[PDB]
Structure 1
């Protein structure tokens, strides 16, 4: 049956049907248009009229324009032929490499795994990053979130994690660009074709790319995540493999939701967001998961608007994570990269029965001395360090070498650090710190532990300083 547009406001389009009303989520195709314009049915307004959301610009639409009911949600290609390709919200290829001939197609909307499909296996995923490896190890099959403010470190980190992890990965990965910088996809795409994780000739590619950058309208940015998500689900279930799913900024999925919620006729919730922020988010995050049928190690970059971690968006994101890496501008401004907050990043894997007592005991040693140094910062700012006991000065000193020894030069950032990248092993990181704590290096200067790999390179740099 034929539906007709009866109203258009930005990205919300009301379509009235005279016969056969399209159910919610059903994807309607707008007629009379140059490129495919999909509307997603969001609600039944009554009077045979449905309110939808456009997956692309709605410029040019005219009331009375015909809209077709595809009879199903937004279905995208899933399968091995997606690998090495770049697709948009609605699964159309955008890498100028022609149709994506997959057998199966998949709806980008699906129910999350049931409670009986849940996995309880915890097994660390060492990353080579001392701060993450140490204080809040990532977990294979786990949900890693990387919170960070504008320009703090999310991207570079996700990139390093793709370097230090993805490459040494035996399986398929899915990178979902959501509301970020298009030239970044550009960067990523060409960095992958280089390293070879993407192959344009032989069919050996291992990465599937879904993109809906900050140039896209709210409806897209609001669903791209589900698309990348859906492409990851195929690899997990319909193939039972270990799937890596990177998503640079899932916060954009929520932000986008707010733009359209406005137009949908919803009274706004706290801070202007939509009422459905929590649920909307749940029905998505819950699909990003490991089941008994397969695994998904997801790494999600999370933007903190106005650097406010209490903002409904990020706030609401923590409960969905198995591991959190909180980046701080204050730390970044002291030139500590990655600007990871030693005292606000967590991992369900930070358990002695899981990473050992030596690992756990050092981790807590570090979060204790830094915590104790942090509580002294009040006194240091007013009365300097001449008003601290002899004991205090000692911790302050070890904290400062620990803080710096937490930094690390990543390959993906060599241009800004002016140092060759470093990949530190786990034992080496445990060791390095056990030592700084035990006072073993209380004779070396702070600046010696800054921007270095293992502890050994902390010493080398010390001699050079003489």
Structure 2
């Protein structure tokens, strides 16, 4: 029903419910806010109290403040009207072009495709880039990762591949900005308008944009990857089609999870990371996949902390 805030520390908010405790992963709406403030249920603490992760800033929150259960996890617009639009972690337009009037919404949480859904077809995707094509070729509908420490060329590479593979592509694309530079989002947006891969007047936009950059609090950065990935899943399944998924930068998802994990009460693991590092990564990565129903060629930039690949 209606809950009350009993505790706030950064992105972690505890909410007590007199009746009807919201399940884990449900989206809660904080009352008395100017802009929508979503809290995602993470844990049932006991004594009718749930532990939640905020999707935006928690400044201004007061103990006792009312919270409403939406009755579902975060749900975002999916389908054709996401194309040419920029949305945030909770699926709101952030491009000043009004509502995204879709017929479909989808939850950003979903179980990974089952073992029977897997494809076994292996086919080369020629990039035109000598070192990749010769030594470590990409595969159509395959998973591609670009590892780099600070400033060595992750983004340039991802942009060259968008230029080389995406240009000649008869399908839809999704770019998800995850914990990166907001102005890089502005560059990309205006470049795609200039090339016409995004069209502000036609229905011919071929890219969906999803962003939660390094100006965002950790809860938003830990979830925008699910949001962008959710958009890609619809195109893969509910059109059966060949989708491209670009993510810059997937490391920021893990880093964001690291920031809330202490606030969640977990005992830290190696190098101070969340003990759930690999399973959080697993349940997210395993959705980023080609299935028998449709192909996703995914390209992920992967930041390397302190240049340490270990």
3-state secondary structure, aligned to 2:13: strand
How far off is 1:75 after superposition? 0.1
What 5-or-longer segments of structure 1 have no aligned partner? Answer: 309-464
Cα displacement string for residues 156-205 of structure 1 (whole angstroms, at most 9, x for unaligned residues):
00000000011101100000000000000000000100111000001100
Query: In 2, distance between residues paired with 1:30 and 1:128?
Result: 50
CA distance in 2, matches of 1:225, 1:247: 8
Which runs of structure 2 are paired with 1:307-326 in the superposition (5 Å)? Answer: 307-308=307-308
Deviation at 1:51, TM superposition (A): 0.3
Deviation at 1:27, TM superposition (A): 0.2
Report the alpha carbon displacement of residue 142 of structure 1 after superposing the two structures with TM.
0.3
Residue by residue over 1:32-54, the C-alpha shift from the partner in whole angstroms, topping out at 9 and shown as x without a partner, is: 00000000000000000000000
More strand by share: 2
Distance in 1 (CA, whole Å) between partners of 2:124 and 2:68 is 49
In structure 2, distance between residues paired with 1:119 and 1:285: 16
Q: Secondary structure at the match of 1:222?
A: helix
Which SS does the other structure have where 1:76 is aligned? Answer: strand
SS in 1 for 2:194: helix
Cα shift readout 1:105-136 (whole Å, capped 9, x = no counterpart): 00000000000000111100000100001100
Q: Cα offset for 1:65?
A: 0.2
State the secondary structure of the residue aligned to 2:155: helix
Q: C-alpha deviations, 1:301-344, integer Å up to 9, x for none?
A: 00001000xxxxxxxxxxxxxxxxxxxxxxxxxxxxxxxxxxxx
Greater relative CO (CA pairs within 8 A, separation 6+)? 2
C-alpha distance in structure 2 between counterparts of 1:44 and 1:238, whole Å: 34
- Matched residues in 1 for 2:119 and 2:276: separation? 27
1:262-296 CA-to-partner distances (Å, cap 9, x unmatched) read 10000000000000000000000000000000000
- Counterpart residue number, 1:275: 275
Q: CA deviation at 1:244?
A: 0.2
> How far off is 1:64 after superposition?
0.2
Indicate the residue corresponding to 1:264 in structure 2.
264
Q: Please state how far the C-alpha of 1:256 moved relative to its aligned partner.
A: 0.1
CA distance in 1, matches of 2:249, 2:134: 24
Distance (Å, rounded) in 2 between the aligned partners of 1:81 and 1:141? 24
Distance 2:303 2:11 in 1: 23
Consecutive unaligned residues of structure 2, counting only runs of 5 or more, are none
Alpha-carbon distance, 1:55 to partner: 0.2
Matching of residues 139-218 of structure 1 within 5 Å: 139-218=139-218
State the distance in 1 between where 2:139 and 2:4 align.
49
TM-score, normalization by structure 2: 0.99
Q: SS of the counterpart of 1:29?
A: strand
- For the residues of structure 1 that align with 2:220 and 2:209, how far apart are their CA atoms? 15
- Rounded to whole Å, the distance in 2 between the matches of 1:304 and 1:23 is 35
Spell out the pairing of 1:85-96 with structure 2 (5 A cutoff): 85-96=85-96
1:424-457 deviations in Å (ceiling 9; x for gaps): xxxxxxxxxxxxxxxxxxxxxxxxxxxxxxxxxx
The Cα shift of 1:139 comes to: 0.5
SS in 2 for 1:223: helix
Shift of 1:238: 0.9
CA shift, 1:208, in A, is: 0.1
How far apart, CA to CA, are the structure 2 residues paired with 1:121 and 1:43? 40
The whole-number CA distance in structure 2 between the counterparts of 1:10 and 1:34 is 19
CA distance in 1, matches of 2:10, 2:248: 26
1:11-70: per-residue Cα shift (whole Å, max 9, x none)?
000000000000000000000000000000000000000000000000000000000000
**Distance in 2 (alpha carbons) for counterparts of 1:53 and 1:114:** 28
Give the Cα–Cα distance (whole angstroms) in 2 for the partners of residues 75 and 203 of structure 1: 24
- Deviation of residue 232 (structure 1)? 0.1
Larger Rg: 1
Aligned residue pairs total 310
Q: How high is the TM-score relative to the length of structure 1?
A: 0.66
Q: Larger helix proportion, structure 1 or 2?
A: 1
SS of the counterpart of 2:7?
Answer: strand
Matched, 1:294 2:290: no
Q: Which runs of 4+ in 1 moved over 6 A?
A: none
Instruction: Say which SS state the counterpart of residue 254 (structure 2) adopts.
Output: helix
Give deviations 1:90-116, integer Å, cap 9, x for gaps. Answer: 000000000000000000000000000
The secondary structure found in structure 1 opposite 2:100 is coil
